[PDB]
Amino acid sequence: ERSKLSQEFLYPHLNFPNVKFLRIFISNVSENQPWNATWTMRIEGRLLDNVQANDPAREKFSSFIESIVVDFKLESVKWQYFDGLDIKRVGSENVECTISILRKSSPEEPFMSYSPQLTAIIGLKSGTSHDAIFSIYKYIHLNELLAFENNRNNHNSNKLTDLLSLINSTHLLPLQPIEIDYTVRVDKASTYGELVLDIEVPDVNALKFNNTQRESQIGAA
Amino acid sequence: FNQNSSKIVNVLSKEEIRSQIDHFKSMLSKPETLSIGKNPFN
Amino acid sequence: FNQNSSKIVNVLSKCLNLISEIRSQIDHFKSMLSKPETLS
Amino acid sequence: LKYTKLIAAAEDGSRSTKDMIDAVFHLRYQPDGVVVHRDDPALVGK
């Protein structure tokens, strides 16, 4: 019960893993351009399964997505909360743009993304608050900075334990989005298979089966 | 390991090497893990 | 941990070979990163 | 215990990377949470 939060009991679940895998395609298809201007580009998404596209009950790519932003360098499209998103415009020269894709985050998910000022000190991108606090305390004890502590944590994180334990709380941040740079191809008619990116999405069923079957609860039973 | 890497890079602070130091520090900001899930197709 | 340590050591060896008290520091850093003494 | 030999072989220096991961893994793994393929030889076949 004391160590429910340490990642030692949460990270790998080789018997019942916690994540699904989603694949995203970014493309554009130039058609009937001078050889007016057609400019459609699409963001497609699909869960890797033996499931077929025609079969109903398939999860939509937009089932687990929060925000999609596309900024050109025209006008910028933002989507707030369809298996594909298509954007068709006019113009033929070319454009390069930034795509930001944010994923839905469950409340059952127990991991918080760290800020770059933290993951520099501890080689961990994401963990519970407990892990960050334990590692920071192990760090100040390892370098004999101990109840006053003065250093690298200071210049990185930019007085006492009761002070640091909330500076770190502030350091923890909500899920950050994925950033990609994508260039529309005007002469390259089909840009379909080039940019394929794979991300992992939460599996709520595994999280629910896991948090209700914990060593603490079974031990109490 | 993180402490020593950051230290020796701050000492290497003193073109190609500039972009490479930027790449290194960005990489240190984001280490990689393994994500494991079930296998849909055997 | 193994993979991250390996990648960092490779890119640091590259950056050090590209930049080749200052000279002695660079030599000692080369020697240190050669083997994984950076952990200890 | 089950992994007492895979754990020992990990830190003794032998089986530095690929040998170990293939020994553990049925399940699917990718080398990171987000994997982007800027250009792929097999994927452009679509």
From Swiss-Prot, chain A:
Superkingdom per UniProt: Eukaryota
Protein localization: Nucleus
Family membership noted in the UniProt record: To yeast RSC6.
Name by which UniProt lists this protein: Transcription regulatory protein SNF12
Function comment: Involved in transcriptional activation. Component of the SWI/SNF complex, an ATP-dependent chromatin remodeling complex, which is required for the positive and negative regulation of gene expression of a large number of genes. It changes chromatin structure by altering DNA-histone contacts within a nucleosome, leading eventually to a change in nucleosome position, thus facilitating or repressing binding of gene-specific transcription factors.
Subunit structure: Interacts with SWP82. Component of the SWI/SNF global transcription activator complex. The 1.14 MDa SWI/SNF complex is composed of 11 different subunits: one copy each of SWI1, SNF2/SWI2, SNF5, SNF12/SWP73, ARP7/SWP61, ARP9/SWP59; two copies each of SWI3, SNF6, SNF11, SWP82; and three copies of TAF14/SWP29.
Species this protein is from: Saccharomyces cerevisiae (strain ATCC 204508 / S288c)
Swiss-Prot record, chain B:
Subcellular location(s) of the protein: Nucleus
Record protein name field: SWI/SNF complex subunit SWI3
Function (record text): Involved in transcriptional activation. Component of the SWI/SNF complex, an ATP-dependent chromatin-remodeling complex, which is required for the positive and negative regulation of gene expression of a large number of genes. It changes chromatin structure by altering DNA-histone contacts within a nucleosome, leading eventually to a change in nucleosome position, thus facilitating or repressing binding of gene-specific transcription factors.
Taxon lineage: Eukaryota, Fungi, Dikarya, Ascomycota, Saccharomycotina
Organism: Saccharomyces cerevisiae (strain ATCC 204508 / S288c)
Subunit (UniProt): Interacts with RTT102, SWP82 and the N-terminus of SNF2. Component of the SWI/SNF global transcription activator complex. The 1.14 MDa SWI/SNF complex is composed of 11 different subunits: one copy each of SWI1, SNF2/SWI2, SNF5, SNF12/SWP73, ARP7/SWP61, ARP9/SWP59; two copies each of SWI3, SNF6, SNF11, SWP82; and three copies of TAF14/SWP29.
Additional observations: Present with 3150 molecules/cell in log phase SD medium.
Swiss-Prot record, chain D:
Subcellular location: Nucleus
The organism's place on the tree of life at top rank: Eukaryota
Segment forming the signal sequence: none
Any further remark recorded for this protein: Present with 2900 molecules/cell in log phase SD medium.
Function noted in UniProt: Involved in transcriptional activation. Component of the SWI/SNF complex, an ATP-dependent chromatin remodeling complex, which is required for the positive and negative regulation of gene expression of a large number of genes. It changes chromatin structure by altering DNA-histone contacts within a nucleosome, leading eventually to a change in nucleosome position, thus facilitating or repressing binding of gene-specific transcription factors.
Quaternary structure and partners: Component of the SWI/SNF global transcription activator complex. The 1.14 MDa SWI/SNF complex is composed of 11 different subunits: one copy each of SWI1, SNF2/SWI2, SNF5, SNF12/SWP73, ARP7/SWP61, ARP9/SWP59; two copies each of SWI3, SNF6, SNF11, SWP82; and three copies of TAF14/SWP29.
Protein name, entry field: Transcription regulatory protein SNF6
Natural source organism: Saccharomyces cerevisiae (strain ATCC 204508 / S288c)
Designated gene of the protein: SNF6
Residues of the full protein shown: 167 to 216 of 332
